[PDB]
Design an enzyme around this catalytic site. Structure first.
Site, mmCIF file in Angstrom:
data_model
loop_
_atom_site.group_PDB
_atom_site.id
_atom_site.type_symbol
_atom_site.label_atom_id
_atom_site.label_comp_id
_atom_site.label_asym_id
_atom_site.label_seq_id
_atom_site.Cartn_x
_atom_site.Cartn_y
_atom_site.Cartn_z
ATOM 1 N N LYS A 25 0.737 -1.448 0.305
ATOM 2 C CA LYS A 25 0.033 0.082 0.023
ATOM 3 C C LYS A 25 0.911 1.288 0.253
ATOM 4 C CE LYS A 25 -3.654 2.484 2.137
ATOM 5 N NZ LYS A 25 -4.378 2.006 1.147
ATOM 6 N N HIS A 63 4.875 10.532 11.117
ATOM 7 C CA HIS A 63 5.199 9.776 11.615
ATOM 8 C C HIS A 63 5.189 9.255 12.921
ATOM 9 C CE1 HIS A 63 9.273 7.801 13.657
ATOM 10 N NE2 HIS A 63 9.011 7.696 14.395
ATOM 11 N N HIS A 106 16.107 11.855 6.004
ATOM 12 C CA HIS A 106 14.821 10.801 7.056
ATOM 13 C C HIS A 106 15.429 11.118 8.463
ATOM 14 C CE1 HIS A 106 13.287 9.476 3.717
ATOM 15 N NE2 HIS A 106 14.799 8.827 2.625
ATOM 16 N N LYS A 163 15.545 12.809 12.187
ATOM 17 C CA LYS A 163 14.409 13.748 13.440
ATOM 18 C C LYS A 163 15.131 15.181 13.595
ATOM 19 C CE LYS A 163 12.244 9.038 14.849
ATOM 20 N NZ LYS A 163 12.305 8.517 16.527
ATOM 21 N N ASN A 184 12.304 -0.139 18.243
ATOM 22 C CA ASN A 184 13.555 0.088 18.194
ATOM 23 C C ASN A 184 13.286 -0.662 19.455
ATOM 24 O OD1 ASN A 184 13.920 2.029 15.661
ATOM 25 N ND2 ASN A 184 13.279 3.656 17.064
ATOM 26 N N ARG A 219 15.602 -0.320 22.528
ATOM 27 C CA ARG A 219 15.932 0.694 22.962
ATOM 28 C C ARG A 219 15.234 2.050 23.414
ATOM 29 N NH1 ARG A 219 16.715 4.603 19.535
ATOM 30 N NH2 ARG A 219 17.302 4.163 17.534
ATOM 31 N N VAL A 226 15.881 8.177 21.605
ATOM 32 C CA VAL A 226 16.795 9.140 21.474
ATOM 33 C C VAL A 226 15.891 10.889 22.448
ATOM 34 C CG1 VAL A 226 17.606 11.242 20.478
ATOM 35 C CG2 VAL A 226 18.116 9.547 20.110
ATOM 36 N N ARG A 229 15.757 18.985 18.648
ATOM 37 C CA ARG A 229 17.451 18.851 18.862
ATOM 38 C C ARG A 229 18.735 20.042 18.079
ATOM 39 N NH1 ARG A 229 17.670 12.047 16.147
ATOM 40 N NH2 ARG A 229 16.174 11.671 17.102
#
Length: 445
Positions: free
Chosen positions: A200, A207, A234, A236, A288, A290, A293, A336
């Site tokens: 699709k 996101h 790609h 963040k 992820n 873990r 961030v 960030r």
């Protein structure tokens, strides 16, 4: 031995995440062992750790990715657990397997879980089984029978995208499905093989990711979501929580799905489920295994200390937080801060000649930098994270603007200017922009 079972911990990482972890440790009375490369002897957390151990020269492959040196570091100091933070070896099964084999507690999920979710096919398979919504597709290579292919596209809903099994073409109607498949066949022939599958096509998705905690004893909870759509190449750039537009009921729907998934796969510790969100539908992309961030954004709107929970879980303690005790309050936005080159987006090394951090209510600063500190060229460009919380989204943004204005970092190139621009972007202020938005605003299309 007894202030916390994990009385001494090796922080197998660097920069801001290592400091973040160090603080969580000090809070709990845990002794810190900071392993570092020869180029990070001046890291803020290293200068604050109880013990410091050099694990190799600057190059990551020779230091922060050096498995025997990191375990030896744990051995010579009598440490009992190792926190890999994010990146580096955090999602490397082999490392976790050796860490535990050497007799140390790996602060992360089980080795088999890292491998499971580490493999795209195994991950998807497990997610569908658990009931987590995934990206609709032909479920296998497409045949030449255009009749079922047309039915597949129909069932999945256009637009659909044709992909080669060994690497893509967008189809918006069944009228062009046949030709498109053959056209894709050819290219791939070349390009790569001849096999082709269908998925699709999620053209303008956002996101959205769900944070979870599982004790590996049957208890798992989700802690709201985060929208991390502001991306460049790609990567963040901005993150916020909760995700604009997501209602409490939709949150509860996707949240309980992820929690159930954790239980089915016997997940242990903190993890994140990243989804593509379009037309009100969630589509699992990857998990992820873990700490994230951008975890602070979630911490501020739930009042939960994710790093400390990771430690308690790794210490065999079942979750003490019940899903019903988890309440989302306010809004948090994260910018960030990178020491990056404006033309390549690559790390921009140099000495910080002047530094002043922002202050005030709802302002969180996660960073190892300080006046006189020099940004090395061997690692990532991230030198910090500025998180601003507020009773609502507008307050958080208003505070981020004010804070970005107070932030001073001279001597090196940063993206602070970019962040100010994004906070003043009318579309961002409205909320809910897709993953392609930023590159549009700046013409990296």
């Amino acid at each position: 031995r007894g202030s916390h079972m994990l009385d001494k911990i090796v922080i197998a990482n660097r920069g801001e995440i290592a400091l973040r972890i160090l603080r969580a440790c000090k809070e709990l009375g845990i002794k810190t062992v900071a392993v570092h490369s020869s180029a990070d002897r001046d890291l803020k957390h290293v200068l604050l750790a109880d013990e410091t151990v050099c694990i190799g020269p600057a190059p990551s492959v020779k230091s922060y990715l050096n498995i025997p040196a990191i375990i030896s570091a744990a051995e010579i100091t009598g440490a009992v657990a190792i926190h890999p933070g994010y990146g580096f070896l955090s999602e490397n099964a082999n490392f976790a397997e050796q860490v535990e084999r050497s007799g140390f507690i790996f602060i992360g999920p089980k080795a088999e879980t890292i491998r499971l979710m580490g493999d795209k096919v195994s991950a998807i398979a497990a997610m569908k089984k658990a009931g987590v919504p995934c990206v609709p597709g032909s479920d296998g290579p497409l045949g030449d029978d255009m009749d079922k292919n047309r039915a597949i596209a129909k069932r999945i809903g256009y637009p659909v995208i044709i992909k080669a099994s060994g690497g893509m073409r967008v189809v918006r109607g069944d009228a062009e499905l046949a030709q498109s498949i053959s056209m894709t066949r050819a290219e791939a022939k070349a390009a790569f093989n001849d096999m082709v599958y269908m998925e699709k096509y999620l053209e303008n998705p956002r996101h959205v990711e769900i944070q979870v905690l599982a004790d590996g004893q049957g208890n798992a909870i989700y802690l709201a979501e985060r929208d991390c759509s502001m991306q460049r190449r790609h990567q963040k750039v901005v993150e916020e929580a909760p995700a604009p537009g997501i209602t409490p009921e939709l949150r509860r729907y996707i949240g309980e799905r992820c929690a159930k998934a954790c239980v089915d796969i016997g997940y242990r510790g903190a993890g994140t489920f990243e989804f593509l969100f379009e037309n009100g539908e969630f589509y699992f992309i990857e998990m992820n295994t873990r700490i994230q961030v951008e975890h602070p954004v979630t911490e501020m709107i739930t009042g939960v200390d994710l790093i400390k929970e990771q430690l308690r879980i790794a210490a065999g303690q079942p979750l003490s937080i019940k899903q019903e005790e988890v309440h989302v309050r306010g809004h948090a936005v994260e910018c960030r801060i990178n020491a990056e080159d404006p033309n390549t987006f690559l790390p921009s090394p140099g000495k910080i000649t002047r530094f002043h951090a922002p202050g005030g209510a709802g302002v969180r600063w996660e960073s190892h930098i300080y006046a006189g500190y020099t940004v090395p060229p061997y690692y990532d460009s991230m030198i910090g994270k500025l998180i601003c919380y507020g009773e609502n989204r507008d307050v958080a943004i208003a505070r981020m603007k004010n804070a970005l204005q107070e932030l001073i970092i001279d001597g090196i190139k940063t993206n602070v200017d970019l962040q100010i621009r994004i906070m003043n972007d009318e579309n961002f202020q409205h909320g809910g922009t897709n993953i392609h938005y930023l590159e549009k605003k700046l013409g990296l299309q």
